């Protein structure tokens with residue numbers, strides 16, 4: 001049975017905050033298709049030669 | 050279950066393969082959609098008891 | 100929309116029948132716990148952060164920007180006053196420095 | 206007649222678990238968990254940050270915190286009643 005993710009119980013309280021002291025410059029990739037191959041079919045030539 | 054019908058159906062080619070492939074693509078697409086919408090966090094957060 | 104994290108910039112790259120976006124994003128890291136309060140009570144007045152948040156390392160109170168830890172002394176220049184201390188729930192008592200005070204003191 | 210229904214990859218309890226994780230992240234950490242590690246913040250302070258996002262000062266949220274909480278609870282109850290009462 002698949003596991004969704006690791007459990008991470010956030011330590012919530014009414015008077016505590018978590019402030020970052022450092023940072024990471026992360027570069028991620030996103031691939032998006034833009035076009036397809038331009039195909040033309042001669043209907044008469046395809047069906048009848 | 051008709052053998053004769055299947056034999057005649059084979060003359061038309063790979064129509065059945067095309068339809069099955071399209072339905073399989075739709076079926077995997079639905080799961081991909083559910084993953085995209087709901088599985089956006091890799092940590093399962095939980096609320097405090099209080 | 101433009102990568103995981105706070106988006107800084109993006110770079111386009113051509114691909115066969117497609118585009119690849121290199122998303123440069125800012126990710127917070129190395130977080131630390133601090134004790135926080137909504138407002139600071141000083142001279143019977145409630146002080147709220149102009150752009151940051153009040154944090155405490157255990158004994159002293161400072162104001163810092165929300166996305167990076169940079170503690171600064173709580174002054175009148177980075178806080179604003181609205182109302183007294185009787186309305187805000189969870190207000191704590193701390194001093195608020197005045198930059199103008201040494202100028203007329205000297 | 207040859208028709209089959211494939212079960213979904215994510216079951217209802219797992220989808221509910223995902224929604225629960227999202228709710229816990231957005232309540233306990235605000236928007237921090239969506240951009241990186243989940244940073245805890247008190248919920249009134251988070252609401253004050255959201256108020257600042259739409260151009261309203263923090264003092265307005267803090268002074269009228271009880272009224273805002275009452276309005277939010279009333280609205281959530283009205284949402285449940287409206288869903289239960291509308292076909």
Ligand SMILES: *[C@@H]1O[C@H](CO)[C@@H](O[C@@H]2O[C@H](CO)[C@@H](O)[C@H](O)[C@H]2NC(C)=O)[C@H](O)[C@H]1NC(C)=O
Pocket residue numbers: 021022023024129
């Ligand atoms: C913030 O994290 C960076 C890493 O991204 C730390 O930089 C490293 O510092 C150590 C010790 O000075 C070096 O040995 C590493 O080579 C550094 N890494 C890089 C990529 O330069 C940085 O010191 C951290 N800052 C704080 C305040 O924790």
Ligand SMILES: *[C@@H]1O[C@H](CO)[C@@H](O[C@@H]2O[C@H](CO)[C@@H](O)[C@H](O)[C@H]2NC(C)=O)[C@H](O)[C@H]1NC(C)=O
Pocket residue numbers: 009010011012018130131132
């Ligand atoms: C901030 O404080 C909380 C609690 O004071 C810390 O949460 C605990 O961390 C320990 C260390 O791994 C765990 O064993 C506990 O189970 C955590 N408690 C809960 C309720 O999650 C938290 O790690 C602290 N964060 C920082 C950055 O110091």
Ligand SMILES: *[C@@H]1O[C@H](CO)[C@@H](O[C@@H]2O[C@H](CO)[C@@H](O)[C@H](O)[C@H]2NC(C)=O)[C@H](O)[C@H]1NC(C)=O
Pocket residue numbers: 156157158159
């Ligand atoms: C919280 O931060 C303040 C500011 O750095 C700390 O105050 C300094 O503490 C050191 C060591 O005790 C002293 O040498 C400095 O003179 C203090 N500066 C001031 C302006 O008082 C404070 O100790 C920190 N609190 C904790 C619990 O670490």
Ligand SMILES: *[C@@H]1O[C@H](CO)[C@@H](O[C@@H]2O[C@H](CO)[C@@H](O)[C@H](O)[C@H]2NC(C)=O)[C@H](O)[C@H]1NC(C)=O
Pocket residue numbers: 140192
């Ligand atoms: C924060 O400061 C205020 C005012 O200096 C404190 O309020 C006083 O509390 C004492 C003790 O109950 C009363 O006798 C005074 O009449 C109060 N004065 C005012 C103006 O309200 C308050 O108790 C302090 N809070 C903390 C946590 O130290």
Ligand SMILES: *[C@@H]1O[C@H](CO)[C@@H](O)[C@H](O)[C@H]1NC(C)=O
Pocket residue numbers: 014015188189190
């Ligand atoms: C947080 O809750 C405790 C009790 O759980 C209470 O005594 C304290 O005053 C609360 N602090 C704030 C800022 O609401």
